[PDB]
Amino acid sequence: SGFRKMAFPSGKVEGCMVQVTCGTTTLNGLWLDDVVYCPRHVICTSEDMLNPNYEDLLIRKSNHNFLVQAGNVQLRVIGHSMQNCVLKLKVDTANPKTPKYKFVRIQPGQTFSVLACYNGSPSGVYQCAMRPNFTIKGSFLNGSCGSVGFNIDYDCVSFCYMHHMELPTGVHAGTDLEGNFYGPFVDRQTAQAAGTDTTITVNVLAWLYAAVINGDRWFLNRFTTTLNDFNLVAMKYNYEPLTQDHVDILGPLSAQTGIAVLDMCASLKELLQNGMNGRTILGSALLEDEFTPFDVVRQCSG
Amino acid sequence: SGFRKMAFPSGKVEGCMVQVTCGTTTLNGLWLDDVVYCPRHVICTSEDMLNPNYEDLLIRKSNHNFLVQAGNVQLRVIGHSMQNCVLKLKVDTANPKTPKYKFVRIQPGQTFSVLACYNGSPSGVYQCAMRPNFTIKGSFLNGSCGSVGFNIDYDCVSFCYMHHMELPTGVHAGTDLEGNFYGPFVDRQTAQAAGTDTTITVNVLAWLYAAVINGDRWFLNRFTTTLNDFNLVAMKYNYEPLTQDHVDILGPLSAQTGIAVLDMCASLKELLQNGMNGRTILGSALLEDEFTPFDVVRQCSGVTF
Numbered sequence: 046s047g048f049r050k051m052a053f054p055s056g057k058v059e060g061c062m063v064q065v066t067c068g069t070t071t072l073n074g075l076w077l078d079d080v081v082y083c084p085r086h087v088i089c090t091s092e093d094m095l096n097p098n099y100e101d102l103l104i105r106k107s108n109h110n111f112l113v114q115a116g117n118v119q120l121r122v123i124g125h126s127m128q129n130c131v132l133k134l135k136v137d138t139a140n141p142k143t144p145k146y147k148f149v150r151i152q153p154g155q156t157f158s159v160l161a162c163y164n165g166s167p168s169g170v171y172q173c174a175m176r177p178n179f180t181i182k183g184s185f186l187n188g189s190c191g192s193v194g195f196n197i198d199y200d201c202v203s204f205c206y207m208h209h210m211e212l213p214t215g216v217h218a219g220t221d222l223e224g225n226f227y228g229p230f231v232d233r234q235t236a237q238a239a240g241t242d243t244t245i246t247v248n249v250l251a252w253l254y255a256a257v258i259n260g261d262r263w264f265l266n267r268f269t270t271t272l273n274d275f276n277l278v279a280m281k282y283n284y285e286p287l288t289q290d291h292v293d294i295l296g297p298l299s300a301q302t303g304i305a306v307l308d309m310c311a312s313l314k315e316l317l318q319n320g321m322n323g324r325t326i327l328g329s330a331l332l333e334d335e336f337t338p339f340d341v342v343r344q345c346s347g
Numbered sequence: 348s349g350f351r352k353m354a355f356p357s358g359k360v361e362g363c364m365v366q367v368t369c370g371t372t373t374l375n376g377l378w379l380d381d382v383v384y385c386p387r388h389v390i391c392t393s394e395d396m397l398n399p400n401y402e403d404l405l406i407r408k409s410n411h412n413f414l415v416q417a418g419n420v421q422l423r424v425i426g427h428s429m430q431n432c433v434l435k436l437k438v439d440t441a442n443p444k445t446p447k448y449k450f451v452r453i454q455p456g457q458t459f460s461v462l463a464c465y466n467g468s469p470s471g472v473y474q475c476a477m478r479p480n481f482t483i484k485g486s487f488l489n490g491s492c493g494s495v496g497f498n499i500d501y502d503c504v505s506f507c508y509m510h511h512m513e514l515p516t517g518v519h520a521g522t523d524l525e526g527n528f529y530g531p532f533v534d535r536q537t538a539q540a541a542g543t544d545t546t547i548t549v550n551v552l553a554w555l556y557a558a559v560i561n562g563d564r565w566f567l568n569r570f571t572t573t574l575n576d577f578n579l580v581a582m583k584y585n586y587e588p589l590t591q592d593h594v595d596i597l598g599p600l601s602a603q604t605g606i607a608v609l610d611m612c613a614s615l616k617e618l619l620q621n622g623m624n625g626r627t628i629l630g631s632a633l634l635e636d637e638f639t640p641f642d643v644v645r646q647c648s649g650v651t652f
């Protein structure tokens with residue numbers, strides 16, 4: 046029993062982290078096979094942070110302008126290419142620690158683990174979610190760019206996030222590993238802001254099911270709701286719409302607990318109206334929205 | 348910026364986890380040098396787990412009774428012994444992935460990372476605190492026994508916890524790597540219960556400093572207090588006493604934020620007596636007590652391993 050914010054074991058990713066320096070800028074890169082992936086803004090100077098022409102900057106670089114360090118070994122860059130906002134440095138040695146891996150672009154509400162790194166070395170691992178406004182609420186300092194987010198269902202590492210920037214509210218933006226930003230953001234220091242964030246309703250419901258599985262029932266009630274009535278209420282609390290896809294997705298947890306999805310929706314309605322009145326759910330005094338239905342099943346059943 | 352519950356990178360420990368099978372029980376072992384450590388109750392039975400004589404149960408055991416698997420490779424057991432509640436299986440091969448490590452026993456209020464494993468395969472990592480009642484609030488399913496907790500200090504892994512059991516409230520109990528239980532617990536399926544728990548005051552203060560470092564300042568106030576005065580309030584609300592050593596340990600965060608510990612204690616004193624008035628701190632509506640002062644400094648300064 047028990048329920049924790051759990052990250053994937055980070056060792057398979059640790060073995061891929063390197064340090065990339067261009068000019069006076071150092072950040073992290075991801076070394077897979079004979080390619081190092083990193084944010085393309087490593088090639089910016091203090092002068093072109095607002096409107097960098099990355100194509101023009103990169104054509105001026107020699108391979109020896111990129112210093113790549115894997116632990117105590119310098120890697121030799123033998124070519125480079127830009128893919129959207131990611132730089133791909135070809136090196137003369139394949140990473141012997143390359144795991145089985147793939148690249149996946151995720152949807153809002155999905156969770157993943159982040160291995161926060163500085164100078165190619167890991168500082169720690171934590172769990173994040175892609176917020177509906179396409180930011181993540183990370184923990185990142187100067188030099189953290191190139192840190193990645195990943196999942197490891199089974200024995201294959203799915204890389205889904207590379208860190209690029211921090212926005213004014215202290216939240217974070219980045220790309221998939223094909224270099225496409227999540228959300229409308231750009232790798233320029235022109236004024237940008239995250240949209241109003243909202244709560245990931247389907248994840249809250251998954252977590253309420255986790256609470257029931259772990260033996261807590263105090264928030265249940267005798268009522269049900271229609272889906273449309275639920276969404277009309279939840280939208281008043283800046284909750285995301287619940288779709289029929291989400292209802293289908295919650296079917297298994299519904300079957301395991303004997304609580305119909307729309308009955309659990311009426312519980313959430315009451316919690317939004319009343320709060321917790323001094324009680325907690327799974328050790329929290331707020332409704333938690335960074336566990337997915339898949340996460341709950343994985344942690345509760347295995 | 349940002350502040351998350353952050354575990355240590357787990358790679359060094361993942362290379363040490365193996366599967367141990369005895370009879371019909373399978374759980375996890377920790378393979379370091381030429382020894383595999385695991386809970387001694389791996390040798391118990393469906394018909395033998397209420398009042399076990401471990402001493403006598405182990406002599407009937409022999410080496411090939413213990414099936415140890417490192418990934419898809421069997422390790423040959425060449426000896427076995429018991430130390431307190433931990434079994435030590437000597438194997439014929441030293442683990443080539445053994446990190447720099449030591450065994451340590453931690454104090455209540457200290458935090459560590461748990462690498463949750465099943466069938467010898469790491470499945471997840473999360474951060475925990477040794478509660479003042481010597482339980483941990485973990486997440487463990489059947490087959491998780493032998494999962495370990497650890498810290499990393501520079502390049503050295505300090506192993507501090509091995510998982511043995513779950514108590515009726517859904518909290519967890521285990522041993523150090525020398526087999527001594529944390530808390531007044533025994534590896535028997537006899538009636539046991541977690542004692543009443545308390546809140547780890549020095550950790551709450553550290554987390555308030557983390558909040559200030561991240562721009563959450565509403566709870567700061569003009570007042571200061573004394574160690575004596577605050578500790579009476581703490582006692583009243585089931586908070587652990589604040590010692591002078593705690594005050595000194597927070598000193599760095601005190602110097603960097605401008606908020607003396609007794610200045611911050613006055614903030615905490617008011618949060619206890621009055622609550623949070625509907626507000627949140629670092630995204631929580633509760634006072635968080637599973638970050639140590641060291642954890643806050645590490646995360647906010649970007650220490651690496």
Ligand SMILES: *[C@H](O)[C@H](CC(C)C)NC(=O)[C@H](CC(C)C)NC(=O)[C@H](CC(C)C)NC(=O)OCc1ccccc1
Pocket residue numbers: 072086089094185186187188189190191209210211212213231232233234235236237238348
């Ligand atoms: C890479 O290590 C670093 C990580 C941060 C977490 C510090 N990223 C950057 O420095 C990044 C480089 C640019 C070219 C993508 N810049 C930012 O993230 C920057 C904040 C820094 C300077 C602390 N953010 C930014 O420019 O956001 C756009 C913006 C500009 C002006 C007003 C509002 C928003």
Ligand SMILES: *[C@H](O)[C@H](CC(C)C)NC(=O)[C@H](CC(C)C)NC(=O)[C@H](CC(C)C)NC(=O)OCc1ccccc1
Pocket residue numbers: 046374388391396487488489490491492493511512513514515533534535536537538539540
């Ligand atoms: C090892 O994988 C497993 C971990 C659990 C989290 C499943 N440990 C055990 O099965 C363990 C073995 C005993 C000899 C220490 N037993 C328990 O943890 C057991 C709960 C199981 C059956 C889920 N708990 C227990 O014995 O607690 C004391 C108790 C017993 C009966 C009544 C009150 C209290």
Ligand SMILES: [Cl-]
Pocket residue numbers: 569570571572
């Ligand atoms: Cl005063």
Ligand code: NA
Pocket residue numbers: 567568569570571609610611613614
């Ligand atoms: Na004060």
